[PDB]
Amino acid sequence: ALTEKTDIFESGRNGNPNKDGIKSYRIPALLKTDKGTLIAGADERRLHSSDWGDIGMVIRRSEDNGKTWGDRVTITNLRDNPKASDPSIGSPVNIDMVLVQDPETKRIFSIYDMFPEGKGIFGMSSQKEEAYKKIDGKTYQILYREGEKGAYTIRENGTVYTPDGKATDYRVVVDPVKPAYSDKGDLYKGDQLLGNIYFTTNKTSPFRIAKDSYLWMSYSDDDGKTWSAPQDITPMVKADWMKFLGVGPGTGIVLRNGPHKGRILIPVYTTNNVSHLDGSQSSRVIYSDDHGKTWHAGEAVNDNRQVDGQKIHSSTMNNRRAQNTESTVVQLNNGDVKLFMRGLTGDLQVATSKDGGVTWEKDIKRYPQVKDVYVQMSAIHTMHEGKEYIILSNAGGPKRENGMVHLARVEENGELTWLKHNPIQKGEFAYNSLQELGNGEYGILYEHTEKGQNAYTLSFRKFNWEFLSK
C-alpha cells in the first residue's frame, strides 16, 4: 500500500557536502508527463540549505514510474561571483520551481525565482530600483552604471544603450550557450568579457541589474531531457508596486474543464513595500491562455478581502495573520479553482475562484481538520470509483515533522469534507509534491532527513487507495 522511500536527491551529512560537492537539496516538484515519465525537480543547494548562494535548478527523470531514475539534468545554474567576499551569498540565485506540462503541446515548463547576487530575497534593495523601462512600446531590462543615476537598457541582441538612447559597445549575453546557461548575464565590451550584470559586489564590469525580484521560465519539448535558455517573464506579471513576486513551488495545473479549459495556472505570491515580509505576503496565480507564450497575473486572494470588518488589498496591507504565501492549486469538476494557501492560522486555508483563477470569492475557508504548521503543501485532484476527491500532503506537526496525507471528498456544492489523515513519513518532513500515477497509484516527492542528513534529502514513495483509506 505504501512503498519504502527512494532517495532521489541526497544531501550531505553532518554539515558536509555529499560526494557531488552538494550540501543540500530543497523544494521538490513532481510531474507525471504525457509519456508517463516522472520528472522530479529540486533546488541543488551547493553551499548550505538557505534560500541563496550557488543553487542550480535540476531534475531527474524516471521512465519506470519511480523505480529507477536517470542522471541529474541541470536546467539553469548561474555562475558565481568569483570576487565575492562571502561565497555563501556570493552568487546570483535561482530558487523554488513550479513544474507543469501543457497537455496540448506537451511543452514542459519550469518557472522559478531569480535574484541577482546577494542574500536571495533578503538582498533586494531597501528602496525601489526600477528593473525595466518601456521604450517605444518595447520593454527592456535596466542596467545601472557605477557613479551614474540614469537607466541604461539592454536592447536587441543584448546591446547596452545609454539612458539617452545611444548604443554602446557593451553587450550582455542574452542568448547564453554554456552548459546550464552559466554565461547568462555576462557583460562584454566588444570581444572582452568584463563581468556579469547579476553581480552586485566587487564588480569587474560597470553594470548591474536592479536588486529586485524576478521570475524566470525554462521549457522542455523532449520530456525533460533538454531545456531552453531561461525566459524572463517578470515584466509580464510584476506590477510596479510589487516588491517580491515568486512562485509557490510544486506542480501547477492546466484547467481541464469550463470556459478556461487549457489555461495554465502557476501559484505565486507577492509582498508590497508597505510591510513586505512582515504583513503582506499574498497568494495569487499567474496564468497563460496561449500555451506558455504570454503570462498574466490574476488578482490576489487578499485584494478587496474583508479582514476584521475592514477591506485590505495585497498592495497596501500590513496584517501578519491575513497573509497567505506559497499555495497549491486544484480545479474541481464543476470548474471552480481551489487555492490551498500556506498561512498563520495553524490550520488549512482555502480560497475559491469561479473564473479560472482571475478573482477570488470573498471568504477564505478554514479547515481545523488539517493542521498547517506554516510550510509548503501540495494537493491534487483525483477520481475514485466515480467520486471526486482531493489529496493534500503536508507536515502533521507540531513542527516540520510527521508527513501526512489528507483525503477530502469534494461535495456537490464544491465544499470539502476531510475523511482520512495518514502518516507517510515519521520524523522530519517539509515541502512535498504529489502526482497521480494512474491505476489507483499516487506518488510523492518530499523533504525529509535522517542519519545526520543535511536539510534536506528529497525522497519518493508510491501509495495506493488502501493507504488513503486507513
Ligand X SMILES: CCC(CC)O[C@@H]1C=C(C(=O)O)C[C@H](N)[C@H]1NC(C)=O
Question: Closer CB to its own copies, residue 292 or residue 356?
Answer: 356
Examine the residue annotation and report whether 51 is marked as an active-site residue of this protein. Answer: yes
Beta carbon nearer to its own copies, 4 or 240: 240
Stretch binding its own copies (CB under 8 A), from 63-71, 168-176, 300-308, 335-343: 300-308
Residues near 386 by beta carbon (within 8 Å), at least 6 away in sequence: none
129 binds, among its own copies, ligand X, Cl ion, none (CB under 5 to 8 A by kind): its own copies
- Catalytic position from the list 43, 51, 303, 336: 51
Cβ-contact 61, 37 below 8 angstroms: yes
Q: Which is nearer to its own copies, 194 or 274 (CB)?
A: 274
* Candidate residues 362, 385, 412, 451; the one interacting with its own copies per rule CB under 8 A: 362
Q: How far is the CB of 213 from ligand X (least distance, A)?
A: 8
Number of residues that bind its own copies (CB under 8 A): 32
Cβ atoms of 47 and 15 within 8 Å: the answer is no
Tell me the closest approach of the beta carbon of residue 128 to its own copies, in angstroms: 4
Distance of CA 430 to the CA centre of its chain: 15
| 27 contact, one of Cl ion, its own copies, ligand X, none, CB 5-8 Å limit per kind | ligand X
Q: Which residues pair with 424 in a beta bridge?
A: none
Nearer to Cl ion, 11 or 205 (CB): 205
C-alpha span between 107 and 119 (Å, rounded)? 32
* Catalytic-role residue among 54, 117, 303, 326: 326
Residues 284, 274: Cα–Cα separation, whole Å: 18
- By CB under 8 A, name the one of 194, 274, 277, 344 that touches its own copies: 274
Residue 305 in the binding site for Cl ion (CB under 5 A): no
> 200-219: which residues touch ligand X (CB under 6 A)?
none
Give residues 114-133 in contact with its own copies (rule: CB under 8 A): 125-130
Stretch that binds its own copies, among 18-26, 57-65, 312-320, 449-457 (CB under 8 A): 312-320
Residue 290 in contact with its own copies, rule: CB under 8 A: no
Q: Is 96 in the site for ligand X (CB under 6 A)?
A: yes
Cα–Cα distance for residue pair 434/329, rounded to 1 Å: 12
Of 29, 89, 95, 233, the residue at the interface with ligand X (CB under 6 A) is 95
Tell whether residue 92 is a contact of Cl ion (CB under 5 A). no
Q: Does 120 bind ligand X (CB under 6 A)?
A: yes
Residue 456: asked if its preceding bond is cis (omega within 30°), the reply is yes
Pairing of strands 231-232, 457-464: unpaired
Q: Which segment (239-247, 388-396, 417-425, 451-459) binds its own copies by CB under 8 A?
A: 239-247
Tell me the C-alpha distance between 285 and 247, whole Å.
9
Q: Which stretch binds ligand X (CB under 6 A): 53-61, 113-121, 223-231, 404-412?
A: 113-121
**Nearer CB in complex with Cl ion: 41/195:** 195
Residue 203 beta carbon to Cl ion: minimum distance, rounded to whole angstroms: 4
Task: Identify whether 20 is a catalytic site residue.
Answer: no
Q: Are 153 and 133 in contact (CB under 8 A)?
A: yes
Q: Is 246 in the site for ligand X (CB under 6 A)?
A: yes
To Cl ion, the closest distance from the beta carbon of 60 in angstroms equals 33
Among 54, 80, 113, 428, the residue binding ligand X under the rule CB under 6 A is: 113
CA 141 to chain centre: 22
* Biggest alpha carbon–alpha carbon distance for the chain: 69
145 binds Cl ion (CB under 5 A): no
Tell which positions 192-231 bind Cl ion, by CB under 5 A: 195, 199, 203-205
Q: Smallest distance from the beta carbon of 286 to its own copies, in angstroms? A: 16
Q: Name the residues that contact its own copies, by CB under 8 A.
A: 125-130, 149-151, 163-164, 239-241, 272-274, 303-306, 310-313, 315-317, 355, 359, 361-362
Q: Name the residues that contact ligand X, by CB under 6 A.
A: 27, 51, 95-96, 113, 120-121, 246, 277
Residues tagged active-site:
51, 326
